[PDB]
Design a protein around this ligand. Structure first.
Ligand SMILES: C=C[C@](C)(O)CC[C@@H]1[C@@]2(C)CCCC(C)(C)[C@@H]2CC[C@@]1(C)O
Ligand SMILES: C=C[C@](C)(O)CC[C@@H]1[C@@]2(C)CCCC(C)(C)[C@@H]2CC[C@@]1(C)O
Lengths: 270, 270
C-alpha cells in the first residue's frame, strides 16, 4: 500500500495538474496562422520534414478550417507553420510553468534553481501533456478545437515513436503527472545548485510511482511497467536534447522563437 | 456570312473581354475571410441556405486552406461568408464596369445612361462571366486559386439551375460576350433616357449573335440555339430581380454591401 505521505504527494501533483492543464485548450487564442495564398539549410530542411502535420480548426458555430502544409520546394515555405507552433509551444510552456509553481516541493527550492529546472525540463513536461491528447489510431493531437494530424516510416522519427510507444502503456493520470514530476526534478540540468535536495526529491517521486504501480496494477501486462516508464523518461531526455539543437539551428536562419521561448532556451537578444 | 461591320462588332467585344476579364483572378487579393474559431429573419434565413458553398484557397507554395460553412443554428453564423462574397462581387463588378467602358457603343452613350445600364445589368454580366469558370461536373466555380464548391434538389434554386443549363449549351467565348452585350444594352432599365438608341444597339447585338450561330453552328444539336440563349437572358433578368430583393433584405438586418455595391444598388448611406 501507498504510505500516507505518498498519497498526499500524488494528491498535490494531481491538484496542480487539474489547476494548470486546460485539457480543452479553451484559452489558447489569438495565435498566428499560416498566411493565405548552405549546408545549414540542408539540415534545417531535414529537421522539419519529419515533423509535418496538417491543421484543423473547428469553430463554435460548426465551421471547419483545414490547412494542408506545402511540400518542400527549396524555399521559405517550410517555415509557414513556425509562428503558429511557437504560439502553441508558448501556451503549453506557460501551463507547465504554472504547474511547477503550485507544487510545494518546487516553491521551496531557491528561485534560481527553479529557473534551471524549468529551463531543462519544460519541453519534456510539454511532450508528456501532449501525449495525453494524442490519438494513436489517427496520429492526431486533439487539442480541443485544434487538431494536428500527421501527414510507418514516420516511427523512425524519435519524437513520433515516443508518443506511439508511451500511449500504448495506457497510463493513468496519476502516472503521467508523476512522470512530469520525475522529469521536472532532474538533478543534473545545467545550473542546478541544490543537486542533493533535487536528487532525493526525484527519488521520492520515483518511489511513489513504483509503489503506485505495484498497488494498482497486478496484471501480467504491467510487469516491469515502472522500468518501462523510467526508460521512456531517459528517451524523452534524449529527445529534448536533439530537439533543442533543431530549434537553435532553425532560429539561426529563420527567427521564430517567442520571448518566453528565448528565455527558456537562453537566448539573450543580443 | 457575317457582314464586315458585324465582324468588327464581335472583335471589339472580344477585345474588351480580353482586356478586362482576369480569368485567373490573379489580382483578386486582400479579401476578407470567415473568422477562425422576426419574420424578416425567417426569410433572410431561407435566402442564404440554398446558395451555400465551401471555400478552398490554394497557395503559391502548394498549401491548401479549406473552409466548410456552419449549419444554420438560429444565429449570425449564416453571415460568416458575406464579407468575402461582397469582396468577390465587388472585384467582379469592377471588371464588368471596365468591360463596358472599353466598348465604343457604350462610351458614346450619355454618362447618366451608362450608370443606369450598369446599375441594371452589372449582376447579370457578373453571372455570365462566372458561368465560364463553372464546373458543372463538380458544381464548383473555379476562380484561379479560389474554388467555391456547392455543398439535385439544389437545381430548384433558379441561380444554380441557370448555371447548369447555360453551361450545357457549350457556348463559345464569342457567344458569351454577345450575351453580355445584349444584357448590358437592355433599353428598359430604370432611368434610361436614350431608350431608342439603346434599343437598336441591343437589336444589332442580337442580330450579330443570330448570324454568328447560323454561320458557325450547323449541327442539329444547335437548332434553336439563338432562341435558347435569348430565353436564358430573360431568365437571368428574372434572377437579377429576385437576387436584388434578397440582397436588400439581408442588408436590412446585417449590413455587408461594399461602397461600390451600395452605389450599384442605390443605397445612399443616409
Ligand atoms: C517547437 C517545435 C517545432 C519544431 O517548431 C514544432 C514541433 C511540433 C509540436 C511538437 C509542437 C507543439 C505542438 C504539437 C501539436 C504537439 C506539435 C506536433 C508537431 C511538431 C513535432 O512539428
Ligand atoms: C452577392 C451575393 C451573395 C448572396 O452575397 C452571394 C452569392 C454567391 C455568389 C454568386 C457570389 C459571387 C461569387 C460566386 C462564387 C459566383 C458566388 C456563388 C455562391 C453564391 C450564390 O452564394
Amino acid at each position: 500500500g501507498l504510505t500516507e505521505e505518498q498519497r498526499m504527494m500524488i494528491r498535490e501533483l494531481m491538484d496542480a495538474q487539474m489547476k494548470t492543464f486546460d485539457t480543452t485548450f479553451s484559452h489558447f487564442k489569438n495565435f498566428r496562422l499560416p498566411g493565405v495564398l548552405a549546408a545549414k539549410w540542408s539540415q534545417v530542411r531535414k529537421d522539419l520534414c519529419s515533423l509535418k502535420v496538417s491543421l484543423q480548426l473547428r469553430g463554435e458555430d460548426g465551421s471547419v478550417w483545414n490547412y494542408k502544409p506545402p511540400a518542400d520546394s527549396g524555399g521559405k515555405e517550410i517555415f509557414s507553420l513556425l509562428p503558429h507552433m511557437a504560439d502553441m509551444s508558448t501556451y503549453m510552456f506557460k501551463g507547465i510553468i504554472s504547474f511547477a509553481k503550485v507544487i510545494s516541493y518546487f516553491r521551496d527550492l531557491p528561485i534560481e534553481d527553479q529557473i534551471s529546472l524549468l529551463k531543462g525540463a519544460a519541453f519534456e513536461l510539454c511532450q508528456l501533456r501532449f501525449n495525453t491528447v494524442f490519438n494513436a489510431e489517427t496520429g492526431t493531437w486533439e487539442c480541443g478545437r485544434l487538431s494536428y494530424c500527421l501527414e510507418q516510416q514516420l516511427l523512425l522519427e524519435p519524437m513520433l515513436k515516443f508518443h506511439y510507444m508511451l500511449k500504448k502503456l495506457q497510463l493513468h493520470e496519476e502516472e503521467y503527472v508523476l512522470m512530469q514530476a520525475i522529469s521536472l526534478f532532474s538533478p543534473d540540468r545545467p545550473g542546478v545548485l541544490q543537486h542533493r535536495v533535487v536528487d532525493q526529491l526525484q527519488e521520492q517521486f520515483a518511489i511513489t510511482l513504483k509503489s503506485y504501480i505495484e498497488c494498482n496494477r497486478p496484471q501480467p501486462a504491467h510487469r516491469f511497467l515502472f522500468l518501462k516508464i523510467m526508460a521512456m523518461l531517459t528517451e524523452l531526455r534524449s529527445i529534448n536534447a536533439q530537439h533543442t539543437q533543431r530549434l537553435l539551428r532553425i532560429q539561426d536562419i529563420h527567427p521564430f522563437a517567442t520571448p518566453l521561448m528565448q528565455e527558456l532556451f537562453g537566448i539573450t537578444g543580443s
